[PDB]
Design a protein around this ligand. Structure first.
Ligand SMILES: *[C@@H]1O[C@H](CO)[C@@H](O[C@@H]2O[C@H](CO)[C@@H](O[C@@H]3O[C@H](CO)[C@@H](O)[C@H](O)[C@H]3NC(C)=O)[C@H](O)[C@H]2NC(C)=O)[C@H](O)[C@H]1NC(C)=O
Ligand SMILES: *[C@@H]1O[C@H](CO)[C@@H](O[C@@H]2O[C@H](CO)[C@@H](O[C@@H]3O[C@H](CO)[C@@H](O)[C@H](O)[C@H]3NC(C)=O)[C@H](O)[C@H]2NC(C)=O)[C@H](O)[C@H]1NC(C)=O
Ligand SMILES: *[C@@H]1O[C@H](CO)[C@@H](O[C@@H]2O[C@H](CO)[C@@H](O)[C@H](O)[C@H]2NC(C)=O)[C@H](O)[C@H]1NC(C)=O
Ligand SMILES: *[C@@H]1O[C@H](CO)[C@@H](O[C@@H]2O[C@H](CO)[C@@H](O)[C@H](O)[C@H]2NC(C)=O)[C@H](O)[C@H]1NC(C)=O
Ligand SMILES: *[C@@H]1O[C@H](CO)[C@@H](O[C@@H]2O[C@H](CO)[C@@H](O)[C@H](O)[C@H]2NC(C)=O)[C@H](O)[C@H]1NC(C)=O
Ligand SMILES: *[C@@H]1O[C@H](CO)[C@@H](O[C@@H]2O[C@H](CO)[C@@H](O)[C@H](O)[C@H]2NC(C)=O)[C@H](O)[C@H]1NC(C)=O
Ligand SMILES: *[C@@H]1O[C@H](CO)[C@@H](O)[C@H](O)[C@H]1NC(C)=O
Ligand SMILES: *[C@@H]1O[C@H](CO)[C@@H](O)[C@H](O)[C@H]1NC(C)=O
Ligand SMILES: N[C@@H](CCC(=O)O)C(=O)O
Ligand SMILES: [Ca+2]
Ligand SMILES: [Zn+2]
Length: 875
């Protein structure tokens, strides 16, 4: 009402980006939630450094309203006359026109802008919100904030860009039964009423708005102390207190490891972690107060799987990295988001590897980030690491595989090329140089270029300023040439236009007879290079350390297949995974005959290692899904691959024994046996499931998911479906809940899956954070594939209203259409998209899933006969 919306565009507030001449210095922020009412109010006073004459001052605000005329102050301290205030929706600004204009910030004096605001705590997982949980039968409340990337402006009025760093003193007025948390320690607590408390926090170091965080809670805590002597504590519901132990351990270990590794002190006096009962992302690195989804923080050794353990450790490590990369040093603009996310995605492996020794984490990078993202980045609809973003929707969209996984992957290649020691010392220099400020990608190359004097900028720009990656084509064992690798052979390889023209400076490594060599393959060597004795076989790209694929001569590929059949151990586990991965991606791209790819799978009855099985399972999953309704090809692909895993599946058995990696192997190998229709593996699943239904037996933790899924799929009915739904409500462990939801999604019953889809609208049953997870689970169901797809269409307006088009997970939900492979299905997709053309954060996902489905159609046309022949002839 007070600051009405205006469509007045004649001003700098029409610009998407904030002006250069205004830099906030300090925020005085006070908020008072009315928890039971789902409302809050607040006042914020912002000290402002002004560098140019202006009659207007503007900053970010969304949904939350200004309640009183804003108040401005001269740097001398006099009150400034204010004509109007107005909201400018198009760029999410609230604007105040002063009478005057004056431009001073010459001394140490600053302008002071004070604002009164009111917002809502309901209907959302972003900004400042409230959610509930049950304790001893009572409904309890917790309120918290979540801001990245452009939601701090929903919590309170602010200069909501990552490079507008300011300092923060936060205070909260809350009921006395509640504790209050923020970035900094508690400074002072004073009684407002006999009912209310005002908790003021100590001044923060300069930080970005997206990192500002506060919470009101009645959580218990688990405590540890760093080598630094600083308190590291995890806040947790009393009921769940025991499940905070493991996260506490890893926080300590990884906190101590990083502080030493980066040669830099953590900037704050304390560090807190807390899982909000309903939380919109995986986790958020809010400085000193890291928020989690319970599945990524809370772990029960008696109920949770090894997979869960590793996820907890990795997310914790991830969030810790940000305390340095992201928090101390922040990217200047979202285009450089990889400086945050890629670094966290890289160092997370180093952190966990220190904490957990026999986890083979460094190798697992290949499975987690490298190989999955080489799939993503082989589409035309990928994007370069440094990404132009011009709207909040575009900004949030780039929190994706490219920023995280390709970021992680090109740092992994960079480290190896530049040597670990120099990468380490280089990261340190960068960290001290830009501390409490912002950096660009160029700034990081330069830092490392001091640690090596190698041509870092020249080489790494090629991996960073254009999308995609090369395949190395091998001629005569020894000559290599580079070419852009695209999954679609019809696609124009020069598009979209790149100044670098899709050629790369490739740090190339190879193994000649257990001796390793290195060369920088230069862009300007247009006709390729020759790898520098008396050689019959060159192993190019060991451990898949470089972000590229190698296409050997067909003769060599044939010789590899035979070498594997004779003694697969001649190659390392990673090398096997890599050769298998490249071959099947090359076959997918029409760059290598499928017979040649499939020949590499012949040895598998003797494969015992995690990495190769994982990348085999990935390759087969795609191929099998393309032939799902081909009653000619499918049984043959099934019979064969069932035969190939049966020995390892049988050998490991249906029982939790062995180390971490073995237990992970068993899960995926037994899962694949089930998937391939192994009667004995399905019988184990059904038997255990039947036992679990008897309500006593606690299933082996690493078998649970498989038993819920294949158990429900093969012998589930209404009685066991209802039982499983009750169990899901009754368990406190989020990690168990999530498995049970996958179980529920696995029933072969349209009526039950319809009931399940209806539950998505019931917030008493499915949490807001879990809706897209469930839709995705249902889409994996041979009935639910089309059911989930139909439901998101029928309920699209409902979802948009619930989540907004700025929600990343909603944008991505269309990827449930990935397995589609007919012209009819493609037309369905295009028809739906044309009906709801406002895609928001779903713009890129739509482009990607369309390209995928078009590739599928083409793939089937090109390869059905070849693959049929290979299987028929073999069988
Ligand atoms: C869970 O899966 C297990 C396999 O992983 C099943 O155990 C296997 O049962 C098979 C038959 O019951 C045995 O295979 C063959 O049985 C025939 C019977 O006619 C014999 O001639 C063969 O000697 C035998 N094959 C071999 C190579 O010895 C398996 O021996 C047996 N065990 C293993 C380790 O494979 C379980 O039955 C199954 N559990 C449930 C509850 O269904
Ligand atoms: C790389 O893949 C090649 C192409 O599939 C393999 O060559 C094929 O081996 C098949 C055996 O697995 C042969 O099928 C047999 O021969 C004829 C086909 O016309 C059938 O009558 C037989 O029944 C069939 N054998 C059985 C047991 O059913 C193919 O003849 C043959 N294809 C071609 C085009 O030569 C290579 O062996 C393989 N290289 C490896 C593994 O190193
Ligand atoms: C939180 O709840 C309030 C009140 O229930 C919602 O405000 C209502 O918004 C609708 C428009 O969709 C109006 O029809 C009602 O009259 C409003 N009521 C009041 C008291 O303002 C509010 O939309 C909810 N917040 C969110 C973010 O969903
Ligand atoms: C957290 O770390 C401690 C070690 O500091 C783990 O140690 C347990 O306690 C004793 C004595 O320290 C050890 O002998 C055992 O190996 C541990 N196990 C049990 C069951 O007590 C502790 O397990 C770790 N927390 C976890 C895994 O949640
Ligand atoms: C799928 O589930 C539905 C719901 O349970 C099944 O229909 C029920 O069948 C039972 C036993 O035959 C009857 O007692 C109920 O009257 C039915 N319930 C409803 C709501 O219709 C159905 O048979 C199952 N479909 C399968 C197995 O294909
Ligand atoms: C399984 O669960 C459902 C839901 O609790 C049971 O209840 C029926 O559900 C349908 C909606 O799908 C309602 O229309 C009926 O009124 C419900 N029946 C009631 C409340 O008695 C269903 O009966 C359960 N089935 C079994 C075998 O336990
Ligand atoms: C590879 O390149 C070298 C050097 O340019 C050349 O001598 C040779 O003929 C090429 N071809 C093969 C098959 O080695
Ligand atoms: C690639 O060639 C150019 C020639 O101008 C050179 O500047 C660059 O350093 C070369 N890279 C090498 C040889 O590693
Ligand atoms: N930086 C967070 C994600 C925050 C968000 O996207 O909202 C993470 O990857 O753990
Ligand atoms: Ca967020
Ligand atoms: Zn992150």
């Amino acid at each position: 009402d007070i600051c009405p919306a205006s469509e007045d565009e004649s001003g700098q507030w029409k610009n998407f980006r904030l002006p250069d001449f205004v830099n906030p210095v300090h925020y005085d922020l006070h908020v008072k939630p009315l928890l039971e009412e789902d409302t809050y109010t607040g006042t914020v006073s912002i000290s402002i450094n002004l560098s140019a004459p202006t009659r207007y001052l503007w900053l970010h605000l969304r949904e939350t309203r200004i309640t009183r005329l804003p108040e401005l102050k001269r740097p001398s301290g006099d009150q400034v006359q204010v004509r109007r205030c107005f909201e400018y929706k198009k760029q999410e600004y609230v604007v105040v026109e002063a009478e005057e204009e004056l431009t001073p910030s010459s001394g140490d004096g600053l302008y002071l802008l004070t604002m009164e605001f009111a917002g809502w705590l309901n209907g959302s997982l972003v900004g400042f919100y409230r959610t509930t949980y049950t304790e001893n039968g009572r409904v309890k409340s917790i309120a918290a904030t979540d801001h990245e990337p452009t939601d701090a402006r929903k919590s309170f009025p602010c200069f909501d860009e990552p490079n507008k760093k300011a300092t923060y003193t936060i205070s909260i007025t809350h009921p006395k039964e509640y504790g209050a948390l923020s970035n900094m320690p508690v400074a002072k607590e004073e009684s407002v009423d006999d009912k209310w408390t005002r908790t003021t926090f100590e001044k923060s170091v300069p930080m970005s708005t997206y990192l500002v965080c506060f919470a009101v809670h009645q959580f218990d805590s688990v405590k540890r102390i760093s080598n630094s002597g600083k308190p590291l504590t995890i806040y947790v519901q009393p009921e769940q207190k025991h499940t905070a132990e493991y996260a506490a351990n890893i926080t300590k270990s990884v906190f101590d490891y990083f502080e030493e590794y980066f040669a830099m002190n953590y900037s704050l006096p304390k560090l807190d972690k807390i899982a909000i009962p309903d939380f919109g992302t995986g986790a958020m690195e809010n400085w000193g107060l890291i928020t989690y989804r319970e599945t990524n923080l809370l772990y029960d050794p008696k109920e949770s799987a090894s997979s869960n353990q590793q996820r907890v450790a990795t997310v914790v490590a991830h969030e810790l990295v940000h305390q340095w990369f992201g928090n101390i040093v922040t990217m200047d603009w979202w285009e450089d988001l990889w400086l945050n996310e890629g670094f966290a995605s890289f160092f997370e492996f180093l952190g966990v590897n220190h904490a957990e020794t026999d986890w083979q984490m460094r190798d697992q990078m290949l499975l987690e980030d490298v190989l999955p993202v080489q799939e993503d980045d082989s589409l035309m609809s990928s994007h370069p690491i440094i990404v132009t973003v011009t709207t909040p929707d575009e900004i949030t969209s780039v929190f994706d595989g490219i920023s995280y996984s390709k970021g992680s992957s090109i740092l992994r290649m960079l480290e190896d090329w530049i040597k670990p020691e120099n990468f380490q010392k280089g990261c340190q220099m960068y960290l001290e140089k830009y501390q409490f400020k912002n950096a660009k990608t160029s700034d990081f190359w330069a830092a490392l270029e001091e640690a090596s004097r190698l041509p870092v900028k020249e080489v790494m720009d090629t991996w960073t300023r254009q999308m995609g990656y090369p395949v190395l084509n091998v001629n005569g064992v020894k000559n290599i040439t580079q070419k852009r690798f695209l999954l679609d052979p019809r696609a124009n390889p020069s598009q979209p236009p790149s100044d670098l023209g899709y050629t790369w400076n490739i740090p190339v490594k190879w193994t000649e007879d257990n001796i390793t060599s290195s060369v920088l393959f230069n862009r300007s060597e247009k006709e390729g290079i020759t790898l520098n004795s008396g050689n019959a076989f060159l192993k190019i790209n060991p451990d898949h350390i470089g972000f590229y694929r190698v296409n050997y001569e067909v003769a060599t590929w044939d010789s590899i297949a035979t070498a594997l059949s004779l003694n697969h151990k001649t190659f390392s586990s990673a090398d096997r995974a890599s050769l298998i991965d490249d071959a099947f991606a090359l076959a997918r791209a029409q760059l290598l005959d499928y017979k040649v790819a499939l020949n590499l799978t012949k040895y598998l009855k003797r494969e015992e290692n995690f990495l190769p099985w994982q990348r085999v399972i990935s390759a087969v999953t795609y191929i099998i899904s393309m032939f799902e309704d081909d009653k000619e090809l499918y049984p043959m692909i099934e019979e064969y691959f069932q035969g190939q895993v049966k020995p390892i599946a049988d050998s490991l058995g249906w029982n939790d024994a062995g180390d971490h990696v073995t237990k992970l192997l068993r899960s995926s190998v037994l899962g694949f046996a089930c998937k391939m229709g192994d009667r004995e593996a399905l019988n184990n699943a059904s038997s255990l499931f039947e036992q679990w239904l008897n309500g006593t037996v606690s299933l082996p933790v690493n078998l649970r998911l498989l038993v819920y899924r294949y158990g429900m799929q093969n012998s589930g009915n209404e009685i066991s479906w209802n039982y499983t739904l009750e169990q899901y409500q009754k368990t406190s462990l989020a990690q168990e809940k999530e498995k049970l939801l996958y179980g529920l999604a696995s029933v072969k019953n349209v009526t039950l899956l319809s009931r399940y889809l209806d539950l998505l609208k019931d917030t008493n049953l499915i949490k807001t954070q879990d809706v897209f997870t469930v839709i995705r689970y249902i889409s994996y169901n041979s009935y639910g594939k089309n059911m989930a797809w139909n439901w998101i269409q029928l309920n699209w307006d409902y979802l948009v209203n619930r989540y907004t088009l700025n929600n990343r997970n909603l944008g991505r939900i269309v990827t449930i259409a990935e397995p589609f492979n007919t012209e009819l299905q493609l037309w369905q997709m295009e028809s739906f998209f044309a009906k709801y053309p406002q895609a928001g954060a779903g713009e890129k996902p739509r482009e990607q899933v369309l390209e995928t489905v078009k590739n599928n159609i083409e793939w089937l046309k090109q390869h059905r006969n070849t693959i049929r022949e290979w299987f028929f002839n073999l069988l």
